[PDB]
Design a protein around this motif. Structure first.
Motif, PDB file in Angstrom:
ATOM      1  N   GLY A 202     139.746 127.843  80.688  1.00 56.07           N
ATOM      2  CA  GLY A 202     138.677 128.766  80.368  1.00 56.07           C
ATOM      3  C   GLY A 202     139.228 130.183  80.338  1.00 56.07           C
ATOM      4  N   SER A 203     140.189 130.468  81.214  1.00 54.77           N
ATOM      5  CA  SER A 203     140.780 131.804  81.263  1.00 54.77           C
ATOM      6  C   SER A 203     141.461 132.124  79.940  1.00 54.77           C
ATOM      7  CB  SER A 203     141.796 131.920  82.408  1.00 54.77           C
ATOM      8  OG  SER A 203     143.016 131.267  82.107  1.00 54.77           O
ATOM      9  N   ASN A 204     141.872 131.078  79.229  1.00 52.64           N
ATOM     10  CA  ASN A 204     142.526 131.241  77.937  1.00 52.64           C
ATOM     11  C   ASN A 204     141.479 131.666  76.911  1.00 52.64           C
ATOM     12  OD1 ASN A 204     144.512 131.043  75.879  1.00 52.64           O
ATOM     13  ND2 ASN A 204     143.905 128.920  75.449  1.00 52.64           N
ATOM     14  N   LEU A 205     140.289 131.084  77.015  1.00 52.57           N
ATOM     15  CA  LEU A 205     139.196 131.423  76.115  1.00 52.57           C
ATOM     16  C   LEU A 205     138.782 132.882  76.308  1.00 52.57           C
ATOM     17  CD1 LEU A 205     136.706 130.719  74.239  1.00 52.57           C
ATOM     18  CD2 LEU A 205     135.499 130.289  76.386  1.00 52.57           C
ATOM     19  N   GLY A 206     138.609 133.283  77.565  1.00 47.84           N
ATOM     20  CA  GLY A 206     138.176 134.641  77.854  1.00 47.84           C
ATOM     21  C   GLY A 206     139.242 135.717  77.933  1.00 47.84           C
ATOM     22  N   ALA A 207     140.485 135.368  77.619  1.00 53.50           N
ATOM     23  CA  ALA A 207     141.584 136.324  77.683  1.00 53.50           C
ATOM     24  C   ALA A 207     141.560 137.401  76.599  1.00 53.50           C
ATOM     25  CB  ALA A 207     142.918 135.577  77.640  1.00 53.50           C
ATOM     26  N   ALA A 208     140.576 137.346  75.706  1.00 52.75           N
ATOM     27  CA  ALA A 208     140.472 138.328  74.626  1.00 52.75           C
ATOM     28  C   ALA A 208     140.431 139.768  75.148  1.00 52.75           C
ATOM     29  CB  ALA A 208     139.232 138.047  73.789  1.00 52.75           C
ATOM     30  N   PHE A 209     139.637 140.004  76.189  1.00 57.32           N
ATOM     31  CA  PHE A 209     139.510 141.345  76.758  1.00 57.32           C
ATOM     32  C   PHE A 209     140.849 141.848  77.286  1.00 57.32           C
ATOM     33  CE2 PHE A 209     138.703 144.338  80.232  1.00 57.32           C
ATOM     34  CZ  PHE A 209     137.818 145.235  79.632  1.00 57.32           C
ATOM     35  N   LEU A 210     141.498 141.047  78.124  1.00 50.60           N
ATOM     36  CA  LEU A 210     142.792 141.436  78.673  1.00 50.60           C
ATOM     37  C   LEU A 210     143.822 141.686  77.570  1.00 50.60           C
ATOM     38  CD1 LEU A 210     143.035 138.941  81.661  1.00 50.60           C
ATOM     39  CD2 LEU A 210     142.653 141.420  81.749  1.00 50.60           C
TER      40      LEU A 210
ATOM     41  N   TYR B  99     151.881 146.000  74.227  1.00 51.82           N
ATOM     42  CA  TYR B  99     152.263 144.640  74.602  1.00 51.82           C
ATOM     43  C   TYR B  99     151.395 143.713  73.758  1.00 51.82           C
ATOM     44  CZ  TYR B  99     154.354 146.706  78.838  1.00 51.82           C
ATOM     45  OH  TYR B  99     155.097 147.459  79.719  1.00 51.82           O
ATOM     46  N   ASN B 100     152.036 142.830  72.998  1.00 51.67           N
ATOM     47  CA  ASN B 100     151.316 141.910  72.128  1.00 51.67           C
ATOM     48  C   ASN B 100     151.756 140.460  72.310  1.00 51.67           C
ATOM     49  OD1 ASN B 100     153.793 141.597  70.426  1.00 51.67           O
ATOM     50  ND2 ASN B 100     153.358 143.763  69.996  1.00 51.67           N
ATOM     51  N   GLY B 101     151.325 139.609  71.384  1.00 48.04           N
ATOM     52  CA  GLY B 101     151.659 138.198  71.448  1.00 48.04           C
ATOM     53  C   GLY B 101     153.128 137.882  71.238  1.00 48.04           C
ATOM     54  N   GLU B 102     153.919 138.894  70.896  1.00 47.95           N
ATOM     55  CA  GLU B 102     155.347 138.693  70.678  1.00 47.95           C
ATOM     56  C   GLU B 102     156.166 139.408  71.741  1.00 47.95           C
ATOM     57  OE1 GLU B 102     156.356 136.636  67.834  1.00 47.95           O
ATOM     58  OE2 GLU B 102     154.212 136.322  68.215  1.00 47.95           O
ATOM     59  N   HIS B 103     155.497 140.202  72.572  1.00 49.34           N
ATOM     60  CA  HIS B 103     156.191 140.950  73.612  1.00 49.34           C
ATOM     61  C   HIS B 103     155.237 141.403  74.720  1.00 49.34           C
ATOM     62  CE1 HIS B 103     159.369 143.489  75.253  1.00 49.34           C
ATOM     63  NE2 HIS B 103     158.529 144.508  75.268  1.00 49.34           N
ATOM     64  N   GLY B 104     155.485 140.936  75.942  1.00 47.87           N
ATOM     65  CA  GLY B 104     154.663 141.335  77.075  1.00 47.87           C
ATOM     66  C   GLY B 104     153.312 140.676  77.288  1.00 47.87           C
ATOM     67  N   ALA B 105     152.652 140.253  76.213  1.00 49.13           N
ATOM     68  CA  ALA B 105     151.339 139.620  76.335  1.00 49.13           C
ATOM     69  C   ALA B 105     151.234 138.304  75.567  1.00 49.13           C
ATOM     70  CB  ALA B 105     150.243 140.588  75.869  1.00 49.13           C
ATOM     71  N   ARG B 106     152.313 137.534  75.583  1.00 45.50           N
ATOM     72  CA  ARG B 106     152.350 136.252  74.896  1.00 45.50           C
ATOM     73  C   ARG B 106     151.347 135.282  75.508  1.00 45.50           C
ATOM     74  NH1 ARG B 106     157.868 135.651  72.838  1.00 45.50           N
ATOM     75  NH2 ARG B 106     159.156 137.460  73.424  1.00 45.50           N
ATOM     76  N   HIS B 107     151.185 135.341  76.829  1.00 48.83           N
ATOM     77  CA  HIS B 107     150.269 134.426  77.505  1.00 48.83           C
ATOM     78  C   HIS B 107     148.800 134.761  77.309  1.00 48.83           C
ATOM     79  CE1 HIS B 107     149.855 137.520  80.634  1.00 48.83           C
ATOM     80  NE2 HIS B 107     148.855 136.813  81.131  1.00 48.83           N
ATOM     81  N   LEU B 108     148.524 135.920  76.719  1.00 44.74           N
ATOM     82  CA  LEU B 108     147.151 136.350  76.488  1.00 44.74           C
ATOM     83  C   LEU B 108     146.731 136.244  75.024  1.00 44.74           C
ATOM     84  CD1 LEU B 108     147.123 139.547  78.752  1.00 44.74           C
ATOM     85  CD2 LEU B 108     146.062 137.331  79.249  1.00 44.74           C
ATOM     86  N   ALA B 109     147.689 135.968  74.145  1.00 43.73           N
ATOM     87  CA  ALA B 109     147.403 135.851  72.716  1.00 43.73           C
ATOM     88  C   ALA B 109     146.467 134.674  72.439  1.00 43.73           C
ATOM     89  CB  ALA B 109     148.708 135.683  71.940  1.00 43.73           C
ATOM     90  N   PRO B 110     145.626 134.788  71.398  1.00 42.68           N
ATOM     91  CA  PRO B 110     144.688 133.717  71.050  1.00 42.68           C
ATOM     92  C   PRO B 110     145.397 132.463  70.551  1.00 42.68           C
ATOM     93  CG  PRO B 110     144.815 135.232  69.255  1.00 42.68           C
ATOM     94  CD  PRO B 110     145.553 135.884  70.414  1.00 42.68           C
ATOM     95  N   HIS B 111     144.807 131.305  70.825  1.00 46.13           N
ATOM     96  CA  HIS B 111     145.382 130.045  70.374  1.00 46.13           C
ATOM     97  C   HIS B 111     145.373 130.110  68.848  1.00 46.13           C
ATOM     98  CE1 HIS B 111     145.762 125.793  69.378  1.00 46.13           C
ATOM     99  NE2 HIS B 111     146.149 125.581  70.623  1.00 46.13           N
TER     100      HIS B 111
END
Ligand code: HEM
Length: 199
Positions: free
Chosen positions: A109-117, A126-138
């Motif tokens: 569920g944390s993956n679903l709501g990770a949009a805000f973070l 920090y994006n899905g390619e650097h620093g925030a890979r674990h927060l990027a949308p599926h």
């Protein structure tokens, strides 16, 4: 509620919001140092559910569940920030059975709501390619990916008795998250966000 997934949500929304408030209260995006503390927290929690995502039994009921794990992504984000893999000081929870299903709900569920973070991580470049890979949308989209996951969760057809244990598991997962957060950010045990704060 109506379904297993909805009862999980209903019974854990208050604690979820307490987590939301506590995370924001410790300012995870105020500095690289604090973002790193946030990544260490994430690293511990995701390491803690890693064995659940890879569980043989659960992968038989939820196809491709093993590939949903984000522990590797968090570890890479730590690498991007110049940090080595983080290891929790204390012993890590290693839940199983119905309670483990609650932890899985919490993590996914944390993956679903990770949009805000993810949006705020982006403010730090920090994006899905650097620093925030674990927060990027599926890749399939947060919502689409989640709805498919929810179908499987409900399809486990857990009895009301089993649900109770799973829900208690989800409550304990959120509880553990705050325990780790407090240790990582140097807060007292049971510290919470300023009372009255809204998500
Ligand atoms: C400041 C941080 C956080 C914020 C702002 C936040 C926000 C949200 C929001 C808005 C949703 C709903 C998304 C949607 O329905 O499309 C959500 C769902 C969820 N979040 Fe968070 N969340 C945060 C942290 C976490 C953490 C750290 C965990 C657990 C370790 C978590 C677990 C969940 C779960 C399980 C759901 C699923 C709810 C459902 O059943 O629909 N969240 N979050």
């Amino acid at each position: 509620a109506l379904t297993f997934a909805k009862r999980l949500k209903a019974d854990t929304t208050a604690v979820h919001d307490s987590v939301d408030n506590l995370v924001m209260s410790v300012q995870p995006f105020v500095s690289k140092e604090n973002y790193i503390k946030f990544l260490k927290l994430q690293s511990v929690f995701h390491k803690a559910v890693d064995h659940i995502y890879k569980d043989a039994e659960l992968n038989k009921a939820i196809p491709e569940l093993e590939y949903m794990a984000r522990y590797d992504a968090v570890t890479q984000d730590l690498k991007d920030l110049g940090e080595e893999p983080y290891k929790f000081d204390k012993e890590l929870p290693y839940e199983a059975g119905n309670k483990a299903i609650g932890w899985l709900y919490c993590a996914e569920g944390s993956n679903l709501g990770a949009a805000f973070l993810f949006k705020h991580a982006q403010k730090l470049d920090y994006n899905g390619e650097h620093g925030a890979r674990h927060l990027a949308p599926h890749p399939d989209g947060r919502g689409k990916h989640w709805r498919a996951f929810v179908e499987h969760l409900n399809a486990l057809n857990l009895t009301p008795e089993a649900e109770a244990e799973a829900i208690q598991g989800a409550r304990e997962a959120f509880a553990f998250y705050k325990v780790v957060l407090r240790e990582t950010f140097g807060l007292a045990a049971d510290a919470e966000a300023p009372e009255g704060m809204m998500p």
